[PDB]
């Protein structure tokens, strides 16, 4: 099937700063990926983003009742829906499971990679650090970065490249808003 | 600090529509257009809130009308296919005989039409699979998740097979134990 496709998108966005103290509403219309017209609550009228959207801005801006609907959106739409969903979105906290296992940069060489697998947490902001015998190791650290699982949980792997010596204790330390104290997991050579 | 987006689309000639709410990149719910039901991404969401699915149907009807208008205005300029990036990963560190989930992440593509197949040892599997709807990105492409619960063994290999009009051949992304 090589028939041409045509896509229309609309995104009505509510941006919240300090709870619902500062709220910005954006009404955005797109043809394929091209935003052609938008309403920005900072402005209070539709403005064409590209030439394609000039007719829509002029026509919609002539509808005072429509504009007054959009000017009230920060209250009647954004703040309202925030109050509806806040208890299970804004306030969602799911602490991570932390697992440490060894691996190899080269399948034939010996174990020279410590993986700190941090799984199932929400929200996304997290800090993961490596320690060798109580001292933070910042060199040789590589990560997948933040991974969305698509089910309101995140994961991340933080890997430390190192040659373990007998005696050493490695610590992976996780901080996250769901925790009141750092979560640490040790690994011994 | 937080962003809630009500994202809609309508696609011709497929006559596909979609209506969803996003919170900080996660789906709160979408509306099943054929059943006219609100589908909460986590079931527990539905006990703390509701949504009248009819409102989505009304918006999608306007989006359809606007697509026809904008198609004309553009002189029937079609969308350019953007093929996806595909990643396969597991929900949690893998241990033999301990239940887990394979995640197939399909990212950065348009249009929102895709064929996805899970393969176990080269054979299609459908038992217990699930998927998300098309999820919006900030660059206005799409992403999507497909899920396969599985029991890790050393005998089974897996692939996520993704077809998309922007790809010349199907994209296969492999997973196996280790």
């Amino acid at each position: 099937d090589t028939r041409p496709r045509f896509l229309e998108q609309v995104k009505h966005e509510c941006h919240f700063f300090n709870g619902t103290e500062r709220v910005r509403f954006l009404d955005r219309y797109f043809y394929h990926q091209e935003e052609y017209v938008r309403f920005d609550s900072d402005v209070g009228e539709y403005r064409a983003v590209t030439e394609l959207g000039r007719p829509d801005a002029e026509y919609w801006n002539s509808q005072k009742d429509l504009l007054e609907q959009r000017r009230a959106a920060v209250d009647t739409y954004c703040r309202h829906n925030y109050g509806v969903v806040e208890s299970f979105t804004v306030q969602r906290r799911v602490y991570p499971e932390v697992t440490v296992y060894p691996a190899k940069t080269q399948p034939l060489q010996h174990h020279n990679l410590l993986v700190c697998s941090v799984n199932g947490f929400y929200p996304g902001s997290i800090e993961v650090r490596w320690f060798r015998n109580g001292q933070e190791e910042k060199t040789g650290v590589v990560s997948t970065g933040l991974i969305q699982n698509g089910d309101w949980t995140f994961q991340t792997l933080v890997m430390l490249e190192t040659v373990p010596r007998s005696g050493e204790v490695y610590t992976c330390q996780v901080e996250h808003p769901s925790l009141t104290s750092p979560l640490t997991v040790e690994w011994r050579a | 600090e937080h962003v809630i987006i009500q994202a809609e689309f309508y696609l011709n000639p497929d006559q596909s529509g979609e209506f969803m709410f996003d919170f900080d990149g996660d789906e709160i719910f979408h509306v099943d257009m054929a059943k006219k039901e609100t589908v909460w991404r986590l079931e527990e969401f539905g006990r703390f809130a509701s949504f009248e699915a009819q409102g989505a149907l009304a918006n999608i009807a306007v989006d359809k009308a606007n697509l026809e208008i904008m198609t004309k205005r553009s002189n029937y300029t079609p969308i350019t296919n953007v093929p996806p990036e595909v990643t396969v990963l597991t929900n949690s560190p893998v241990e033999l005989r301990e239940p887990n989930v394979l995640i197939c992440f399909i990212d950065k593509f348009t249009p929102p039409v895709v064929n996805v197949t899970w393969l176990r040892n080269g054979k299609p599997v459908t038992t217990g699979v699930s998927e998300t709807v098309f999820l919006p990105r900030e660059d206005h492409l799409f992403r999507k998740f497909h899920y396969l619960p599985f029991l890790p063994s050393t005998e089974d290999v897996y692939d996520c097979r993704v077809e998309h009009w922007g790809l010349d051949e199907p994209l296969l992304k492999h997973w196996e134990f280790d």
């Binding site: 609907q69 829906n81 969903v85 | 009500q6 949504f51 306007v62 904008m70």
Partner: peptide, 13 residues
Amino acid sequence: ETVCPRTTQQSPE
């Protein structure tokens, strides 16, 4: 308790 939709409006023809 009810999430409220923002309506979309029709472009000029």
